[PDB]
């Protein structure tokens, strides 16, 4: 075996074709399935795995009540091969209420965060064993990507934040080798808030698109150099913005360097990627709630801040059905690197008061150079009939 390097060119994407679905909430009405939120997908050189933060309980269980809180002592990182639902035989890889994972070409790295809100710990687990640990530097909810990390020539990178969600915060980029922390860089450039980054290999470096909870409805961008640990940042130029809430496409605007200051407060985890001067991206169909999901290409949207010329729209989930977090992952092909994405399908409390629990299903799509049709692939569970 050898470490991954991702040195192949990006594939010629024309849109996205269906790849997988879990059906977790429909199976839960007659089966022992784990309660989860904040899922993600990552792949070793041979196959893909689904990850999720469990709530330490099955769905048809007295412990499923009040599962809405994001931080508790019982949360653990679940791991399965893609397509196998989270049943009682699932492996718990670490204690965590926030996490990130990746495979370096030899073994898995897991980054796991747990502890008190004002004194949390981050554990680095590599090849099955704890190798390093670090403590909250700003004493205010240490957190990471909720999605895969990226590794080149054995050096993995991860984005971590500490501090306020509605003001200035401390963001650092950690460089890791076989679980050992080897370097740390502080955030640099014009990005003013950085949460929940989605990252992809762009040899020789790494590129990340993130969430701005403070002032932008446009998404921040972070570029990371693996050879000299240098960092730079900016915003997605596109006039069609990716965050939620946001202004309608008739009145929205963006800036390549600064938060657009339009419906800036709050947000949702998402993704976008460059295709020459064009940008591919996904977002909720509704502008002020996490309903539906759509993807499209914006012409010159990576370099021209005034462009609103879209093409190749696809609906993934129609406007009447709930969505949630979404994120990119990369798969190596015979001659090029493909981009794929996943969508969290949240159900239950606080919006759906028919039940006491909160949980999610998932759906997965991959970039295609071929042709495709139309459809909608929602969660599909009937909360009016299944257990409360």
């Amino acid at each position: 075996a050898e470490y991954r390097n991702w040195s192949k060119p990006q594939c010629d994407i024309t849109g996205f074709a269906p790849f997988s679905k879990d059906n977790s909430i429909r199976l839960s009405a007659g089966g022992d399935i784990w309660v989860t939120r904040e899922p993600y997908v990552s792949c070793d050189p041979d196959k893909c795995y689904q990850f999720a933060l469990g709530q330490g309980t099955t769905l048809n269980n007295v412990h499923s009540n009040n599962t809405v809180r994001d931080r508790t002592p019982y949360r653990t990182l679940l791991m399965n091969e893609l397509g196998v639902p989270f049943h009682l035989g699932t492996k718990q890889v670490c204690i965590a209420w926030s996490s990130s994972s990746c495979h370096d070409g030899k073994a898995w790295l897991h980054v796991c965060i747990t502890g008190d809100d004002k004194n949390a710990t981050a554990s680095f687990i590599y090849n099955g064993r704890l190798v390093d640990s670090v403590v909250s530097w700003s004493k205010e909810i240490l957190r990471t990507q909720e999605s895969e990390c990226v590794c080149i020539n054995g050096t993995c990178t991860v984005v971590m934040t500490d501090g306020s969600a509605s003001g200035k915060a401390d963001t650092k980029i950690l460089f890791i080798e076989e679980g050992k922390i080897v370097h740390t860089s502080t955030l640099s450039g014009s990005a003013q808030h950085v949460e929940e980054c989605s990252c992809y290999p762009r040899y020789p470096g790494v590129r990340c698109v993130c969430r701005d909870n403070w002032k932008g409805s446009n998404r921040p961008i972070v570029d990371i150099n693996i050879k000299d640990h240098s960092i730079v940042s900016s915003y997605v130029c596109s006039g069609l913005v990716g965050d939620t809430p946001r202004k309608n496409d008739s009145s929205s605007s963006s800036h390549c360097l600064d938060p657009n200051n339009e419906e800036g407060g709050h947000g949702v985890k998402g993704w976008a990627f460059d295709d020459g001067n064009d940008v591919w991206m996904g977002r909720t169909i509704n502008e002020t709630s996490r309903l539906g999901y759509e993807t499209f290409k914006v012409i010159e949207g990576w370099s021209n801040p005034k462009s609103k010329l879209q093409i190749n729209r696809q609906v993934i989930v129609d406007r009447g059905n709930r969505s949630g977090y979404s994120g990119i992952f990369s798969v190596e092909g015979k001659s090029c690197i493909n981009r794929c994405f996943y969508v969290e399908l949240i159900r239950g409390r606080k919006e759906e008061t028919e039940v006491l629990w909160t949980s999610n299903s998932i759906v997965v799509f991959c970039g295609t150079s071929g042709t495709y049709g139309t459809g909608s692939w929602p969660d599909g569970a009937d909360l009016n009939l299944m257990p409360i």
């Epitope: 809405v68 809180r69 994001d70 931080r71 926030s98 809100d117 004002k118 004493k139 205010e140 909810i141 957190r143 306020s164 969600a165 509605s166 407060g265 709050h266 002020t288 606080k350």
Partner: antibody, heavy 128, light 109 residues
């Protein structure tokens, strides 16, 4: 009873800083957030910020984000608010209040952030 | 960010009659709306929360109404102690927690 008790009135010169404090009479600092709200003469109410007494996450309104800081102590069972770079315009009654909210979700934000109980209010005036 | 508009600006009515106040939000606040009463020379007091339920200090004569973007408060059989300023406030998920500019009530004796 639980009710909040505030520090006395103050006069401060421009460019100076002021400390105001708020204590629970019942010793019962549960994790419900303590918030600061001000009222300028003949003008409406204005939220400035707050903190959870046990979990310790502070928050501030954008207009005051460079100027104000919050801290708390369970032993004195008191919340302390510091306002810096004072000007004549800051002359107002400052009230501490107890919110219906006691947890913050990383993703979903806050819930029940309305003020159930209020302190006596402290008059702060900025003058030479 | 979210703007709260309250009307009328001033209201005056005689004792023994019904009075009504209204509040509007620049976006839908999904029932995350509260009302306060402030008597002259005193700290404000919570009157209603979640647009629908009244605090321990007030009786059946006070009622809340509305949802989404428009809300209403009604006082039944007005009395001498009702002469005060009233304010609406939203608390929809994220800061800042903006208040309305308030409505003043004075009694036409």
């Amino acid at each position: 009873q639980v009710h909040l008790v505030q520090s006395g009135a103050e006069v401060k010169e421009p460019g100076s800083s002021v400390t105001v404090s708020c204590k629970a009479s019942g010793g019962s600092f549960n994790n419900q957030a303590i918030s600061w709200v001000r009222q300028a003469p003949g003008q409406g109410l204005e939220w400035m910020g707050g903190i959870f007494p046990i979990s310790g996450t502070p928050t501030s309104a954008q207009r005051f984000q460079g100027r104000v800081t919050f801290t708390a102590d369970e032993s004195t069972t008191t919340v302390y608010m510091d306002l810096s770079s004072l000007r004549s315009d800051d002359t107002a009654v400052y009230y501490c209040a107890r919110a219906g909210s006691d947890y913050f979700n990383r993703d979903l934000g806050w819930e029940n952030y309305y003020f159930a109980s209020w302190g006596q209010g402290t008059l702060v005036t900025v003058s030479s | 960010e979210i703007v709260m508009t309250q009307s009328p600006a001033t209201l005056s009515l005689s004792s023994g009659e019904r009075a009504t106040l209204s509040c509007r939000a620049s976006r839908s606040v999904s029932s995350n709306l509260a009302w306060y009463q402030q008597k002259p020379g005193q700290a404000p007091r919570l009157l209603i929360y979640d647009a629908s339920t009244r605090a321990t200090g007030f009786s059946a004569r006070f009622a809340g109404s509305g949802s989404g973007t428009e809300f209403t408060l009604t006082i039944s059989s007005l009395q001498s102690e009702d002469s005060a300023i009233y304010y609406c406030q939203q608390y929809n998920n994220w800061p800042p927690w903006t208040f309305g500019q308030g409505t003043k009530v004075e009694i036409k004796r």
